[PDB]
């Protein structure tokens, strides 16, 4: 006897009052936990790419190197985005959720997760958003899977946190199917601003237009977390369908609690709002990878677990 999700339209949204009603109306459809402002609004930019004239000289390292190279520029653009004709907020600094430090004892993840700034997660956090480090790195796959556990765990992994994407959409196995790694840049908002969010979405659409895209993006989704007591190559094209939105439903069930616990933020008695995804599409060229070819090319210090 209790719901866990609640969806409301984006058209006219405002957080429910904290205490304006002592007792909610008996036939009201809003769940009993939908009272205060959310802990944070989560915005995800789903980046999907493809290599059109795929040929035999490409290697599995390219499948990771080509998309993640654009990640640094995309993150910089998102961070420096400003609404040029704003009436309220201008940039991301006035709306993002600030984090000071990780919990003591998580020093192993220092310089891997953001600190003393906006909570902005991207695969560039592996190299600290430094394209120089990314280019000088001789083992991209090794760096990505450096902290990957060898056995299943309840908590979400650092790779999952920094990619914002289910496991099957990434990984080295994509090269066998000629597909390409797809990742997500996750933005965590303390406040909601429809004008700023629309400006960001339109700016990203102008920069990286997505062909044959018809995503709805009509409703927010509110997720409430309960307390726990135990005492002829034919490279596939970039298709956007009904399973690209609502992709957070396929993450691990401890993803968001794991992410928020690192910064001493609890979701035990509260809820979060998940904004509709912002599509971004990249078109890549094999000649780019062939020119960016490096020594130590096809020998990484990483193999899939259990073969």
């Amino acid at each position: 006897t209790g719901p866990v999700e609640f969806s409301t339209p984006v058209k006219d949204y405002s957080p429910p009052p904290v205490d304006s009603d002592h007792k909610q109306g008996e036939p009201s459809e809003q769940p009993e936990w939908y009272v205060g402002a959310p802990v944070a609004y989560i915005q995800q930019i789903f980046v999907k790419s493809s290599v059109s004239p795929w040929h035999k000289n490409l290697l599995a390292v390219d499948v990771f190197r080509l998309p993640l190279s654009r990640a640094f520029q995309l993150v910089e653009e998102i961070r420096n985005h400003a609404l040029r004709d704003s009436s309220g907020v201008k940039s991301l600094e006035e709306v993002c959720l600030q984090v000071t430090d990780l919990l003591p004892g998580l020093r192993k993840l220092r310089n891997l997760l953001p600190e003393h700034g906006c909570l902005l997660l991207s695969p560039g956090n592996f190299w600290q958003n430094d394209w120089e480090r990314f280019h000088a790195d001789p083992d991209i796959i090794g760096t990505i899977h450096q902290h990957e556990p060898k056995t299943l765990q309840t908590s979400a992994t650092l790779k999952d946190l920094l990619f914002g994407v289910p496991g099957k959409y990434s990984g080295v196995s994509l090269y066998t199917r000629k597909r390409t790694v797809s990742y997500t840049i996750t933005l965590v908002f303390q406040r909601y601003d429809s004008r700023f969010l629309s400006s960001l979405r339109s700016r990203l659409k102008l920069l990286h237009p997505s062909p044959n895209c018809s995503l709805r993006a009509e409703n927010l989704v509110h997720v409430h977390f309960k307390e726990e007591i135990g005492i002829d190559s034919r490279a596939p094209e970039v298709t956007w369908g009904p399973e690209d939105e609502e992709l957070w439903r396929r993450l691990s069930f401890r993803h968001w609690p794991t992410l928020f616990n690192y910064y001493n933020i609890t979701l035990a008695k509260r809820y979060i709002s998940l904004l509709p995804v912002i599509p971004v599409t990249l078109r890549l060229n094999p000649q780019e990878a062939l020119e960016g070819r490096q020594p130590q090319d096809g020998r990484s210090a990483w193999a899939p677990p259990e073969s």
Partner: antibody
Amino acid sequence: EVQLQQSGAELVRPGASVKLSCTASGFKIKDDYIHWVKQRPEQGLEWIGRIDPANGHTRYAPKFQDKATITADTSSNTAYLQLSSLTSEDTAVYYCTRYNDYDAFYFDYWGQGTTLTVSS
Amino acid sequence: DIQMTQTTSSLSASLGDRVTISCRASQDIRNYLNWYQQKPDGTVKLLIYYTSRLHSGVPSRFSGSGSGTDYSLTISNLEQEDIATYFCQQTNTLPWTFGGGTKLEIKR
């Protein structure tokens, strides 16, 4: 579908004040900004300013700080432009327009325009 | 402020032929140039936004291209209803400015 119906022509003595009107049909002005554009026969198009009806926040070009005043009314679904201290230089055709994309900032729908004449 | 200049104020043309309209910005505007069509009746219509994006319902005859400070608007084949005045607007710096406008004419 979306339309912007403006008022009629005006003929006002210099030194007076005028209040143009812009009635929006097919959408609520609470959603998008409302802009006013000045056009003269031999001076091109000039941008005056805009209003956010959901907030009442307005801003103007530096040339129109002491000349124009824009106001909007959600209930009547109408936006107004007020010109003060009229002068012979102020005769022009004033257009009412909006945008819906907030990064490209393109005026997607335009009114028919109101001709304003200033003469003794 | 950014000044937009349409050098060819009047441009002679003919039906069927292709027409190009070019305006140059005082400084880089980062592909933020919209094109507007003003019919002789007085109505203003939007053709191209950003730098090459066609507005919904605009015929495919219209196209745009350019970079930096130089941009252009082209018509594949001029029709009778295409005779109007064309303005280019920059939306890079907040005080939006328009061009001088170019009026198309029929060859005689």
